[PDB]
Design a protein around this ligand. Structure first.
Ligand SMILES: *[C@@H]1O[C@H](CO)[C@@H](O[C@@H]2O[C@H](CO)[C@@H](O)[C@H](O)[C@H]2NC(C)=O)[C@H](O)[C@H]1NC(C)=O
Length: 388
């Protein structure tokens, strides 16, 4: 425990007053108020730039953590702009891009920070993409990076959960995000293709289960992004859907990880069937780690069959105060899932609503993650019923 780096990414689970609150565009609130009102969880990290294709470049994940890789979500990037006196960079020198949004000068606003009353210059952009998507910031010169004090990413998951990240220049967590240019190994697909490896390291004790068999665990969650930056090759006299300006493409890992190292899971996870639903229970000490702070529960599933029909819900579970240990649903209704906790026995119960048929052509999948600031538990469930 003592030997783990103290300079990695960390996260807080938050307890917002109004779980129906949303970000309004154009931005009219300071960053901290946006977080207060619309974030259910926040990850802290360092804002870093590399000199790439002749500008200072930052590459940020829309979500640092794995919950639902294929699920679509909406992200809002909000950055603080304040150039030192000696640096001569215009707001128009900053561009950003991300999924669903071409390279562009972001929209700028001025807001008043009610805390200290000070004025603040912010820029923002809205993206639509999966969890694995990226936001890329570009600014020129050697001093351009000094104008961006911090960047907030608010990722609204399919569940409605607000999963946020705050990247500050000179954040203490300097080992939490590392970026380095690497040689491109596969055949080029972009003009002026430039490959970057981004290693995300978070100090959090994570465990992954299938039912109640432990698949993997550790003190540090590590994720490596391999990203190609460059420009789409545009054929003469041809309309292309791909936008102009700089883009990115995801690259595959060098060593294929298309195997299951942990093959000891049952093909159908043990549970209690009631024909109307399957119920799973397990013991956890998670709520004893919470440090008086909430636990965030994210659950999603897919019946298989469908190419990309995902069901997702999220719950905030405070561990002190009114109705403590009672899950608060983040969106209005969660039809597929019910989550309940029995403090006396320290037992969670997950109910999965399912349809009638049961004995053929079924490959349902459910993932439940429950996390505090310092612990996370993921649990995979393999169904032989079709999910509602
Ligand atoms: C690689 O270097 C530069 C990249 O800056 C390429 O020139 C253009 O750069 C501007 C931005 O400064 C981009 O808007 C253009 O997209 C770049 N040109 C093209 C065709 O993409 C330069 O052309 C590239 N050099 C080589 C040999 O390909």
């Amino acid at each position: 425990a003592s030997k783990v780096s103290s300079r990695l990414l960390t996260q807080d689970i938050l307890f917002r007053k109004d779980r129906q609150a949303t970000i309004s565009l154009p931005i009219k609130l300071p960053v901290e108020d946006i977080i207060t009102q619309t974030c259910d969880k926040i990850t802290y990290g360092p804002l870093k730039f590399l000199d790439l294709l002749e500008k200072e470049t930052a590459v940020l994940p829309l979500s640092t953590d794995i919950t639902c890789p294929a699920c679509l979500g909406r992200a809002v990037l909000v950055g603080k702009w304040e150039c030192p006196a000696h640096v001569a960079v215009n707001e128009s020198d900053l561009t950003v891009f991300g999924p669903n949004k071409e390279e562009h000068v972001p929209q700028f606003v001025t807001v008043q920070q009610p805390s200290d009353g000070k004025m603040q210059r912010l820029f923002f952009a809205k993206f639509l993409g999966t969890e694995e998507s990226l936001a890329v910031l570009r600014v020129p010169g050697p001093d351009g990076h000094l104008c961006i004090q911090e960047a907030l990413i608010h990722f609204k998951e399919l569940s409605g959960a607000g999963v946020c990240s705050l990247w500050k220049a000179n954040d203490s967590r300097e080992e939490g995000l590392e970026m380095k240019q690497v040689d491109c190994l596969e055949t080029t697909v972009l003009e002026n293709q430039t490959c970057i490896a981004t290693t995300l390291s978070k100090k959090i004790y994570h465990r992954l289960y299938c039912g109640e068999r432990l698949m993997t665990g550790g003190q540090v969650s590590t994720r490596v992004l391999l990203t190609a930056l460059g420009f789409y090759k545009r054929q003469p006299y041809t309309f292309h859907r791909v936008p102009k300006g700089m883009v990115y493409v995801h690259l595959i890992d060098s060593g294929s990880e298309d195997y299951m190292e942990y093959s000891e899971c049952e093909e159908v996870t043990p549970g209690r069937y009631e024909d109307k639903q399957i119920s799973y229970t397990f013991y956890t000490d998670l709520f004893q780690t919470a440090d008086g702070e909430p636990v965030l529960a994210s659950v999603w599933g897919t019946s298989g069959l469908k190419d990309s029909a995902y069901e997702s819900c999220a719950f905030v579970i405070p561990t002190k105060g009114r109705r403590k240990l009672v899950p608060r649903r983040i969106m209005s209704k969660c039809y597929p899932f019910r989550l309940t906790y029995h403090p006396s026995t320290m037992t969670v119960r997950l109910d999965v609503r399912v349809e009638k048929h049961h004995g053929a052509t079924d490959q349902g999948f459910v993932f439940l993650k429950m996390e505090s600031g310092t612990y996370s538990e993921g649990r995979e469930y393999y169904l032989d019923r079709v999910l509602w």
